[PDB]
Scaffold this active site. Structure first.
Site, mmCIF file in Angstrom:
data_model
loop_
_atom_site.group_PDB
_atom_site.id
_atom_site.type_symbol
_atom_site.label_atom_id
_atom_site.label_comp_id
_atom_site.label_asym_id
_atom_site.label_seq_id
_atom_site.Cartn_x
_atom_site.Cartn_y
_atom_site.Cartn_z
ATOM 1 C CB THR A 6 -0.910 0.093 1.243
ATOM 2 O OG1 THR A 6 -0.103 0.138 2.429
ATOM 3 C CG2 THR A 6 -1.848 -1.085 1.312
ATOM 4 C CB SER A 7 0.145 4.656 -1.332
ATOM 5 O OG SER A 7 0.251 4.299 -2.697
ATOM 6 C CG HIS A 62 5.096 -0.997 3.427
ATOM 7 N ND1 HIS A 62 4.054 -1.012 4.328
ATOM 8 C CD2 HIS A 62 4.622 -0.395 2.311
ATOM 9 C CE1 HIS A 62 2.994 -0.447 3.780
ATOM 10 N NE2 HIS A 62 3.310 -0.069 2.555
ATOM 11 N N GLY A 63 8.130 -2.479 6.240
ATOM 12 C CA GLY A 63 9.191 -3.345 6.721
ATOM 13 C C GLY A 63 8.661 -4.595 7.388
ATOM 14 C CB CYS A 110 5.803 -3.048 10.042
ATOM 15 S SG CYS A 110 4.326 -2.036 10.120
#
Lengths: 239, 4
Positions: free
Chosen positions: A34-35, A93-94, A135
């Site tokens: 997701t953006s 993100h992660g 994350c």
């Protein structure tokens, strides 16, 4: 000369150093990621905050995994002799141990390895700060009512969230961690040692934020950041 | 509020 102490990093080199900000907002459709609405707010806040600390800030947006690796390699190959420190901020993100390029994951270890004491000699003995908003897994915190040196030495990872946990980003206000970090740096960089600034960041995130969601699974959740220090000296941004 |  009078008595000398060396309990704090030398921060009066001609330059404070680089602050590299990697701001990943939009991901390749094929990844299904997701953006990250609100991340530009974080990037702008970080740019201003570190500019005022006299870092040479470089902002990069929407980098692939290949671009992240090449940027980090190139930066580690610069001559940092005149620089006191190095800062890298990753917004993406992660998962645990991972940060996402726009087209796929990058091992955090791969990124930080370029800056090892034996691989970036002009940063040996200088603090290398990695600030990460991403994350670290999918757990949710429900809260409760109230002479050689090691090659891994002199790194600090200021992680937005505890190991294993999601990290929260508000689409309007920016991430809980980055907004709190910038606020505490603005207020205390001329007064407190960096671990104590980050401790105030921990308290701010833990006390002032709680998620709101129509989805019971994601509603009323809390967050604590995670300071990981391999530093060998106290770090003050002033001198 | 969104997660990363």
């Amino acid at each position: 000369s009078g008595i000398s102490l060396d309990n704090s990093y030398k921060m009066d080199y001609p330059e404070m150093g680089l602050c590299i900000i990697i701001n990943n907002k939009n991901f390749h459709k094929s990844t299904g990621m997701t953006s990250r609405s609100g991340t530009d707010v974080d990037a702008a806040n970080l740019r201003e905050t570190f500019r005022n600390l006299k870092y040479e800030v470089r902002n990069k947006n929407d980098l692939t995994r290949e671009e992240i690796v090449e940027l980090m390699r190139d930066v580690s190959k610069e001559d940092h002799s005149k620089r006191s420190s190095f800062v890298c901020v990753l917004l993406s993100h992660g998962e645990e141990g991972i940060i996402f390029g726009t087209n796929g994951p990058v091992d955090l270890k791969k990124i930080t390895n370029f800056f090892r004491g034996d691989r970036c000699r002009s940063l040996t003995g200088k603090p290398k700060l990695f600030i990460i908003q991403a994350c670290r897994g999918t757990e949710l915190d429900c809260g409760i009512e109230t002479h050689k040196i090691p090659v891994e030495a002199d790194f600090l990872y200021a992680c937005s969230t505890a190991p294993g946990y999601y990290s929260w980003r508000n689409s309007k206000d920016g991430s809980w961690f980055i907004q709190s970090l910038c606020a505490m740096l603005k207020q205390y960089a001329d007064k407190l040692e960096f671990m104590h600034i980050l401790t105030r960041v921990n308290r701010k995130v833990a006390t002032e934020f709680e998620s709101f969601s129509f989805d019971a699974t994601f509603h009323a959740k809390k967050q604590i950041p995670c300071i990981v220090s391999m530093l060998t000296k106290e770090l003050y941004f002033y001198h | 509020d969104e997660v990363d």
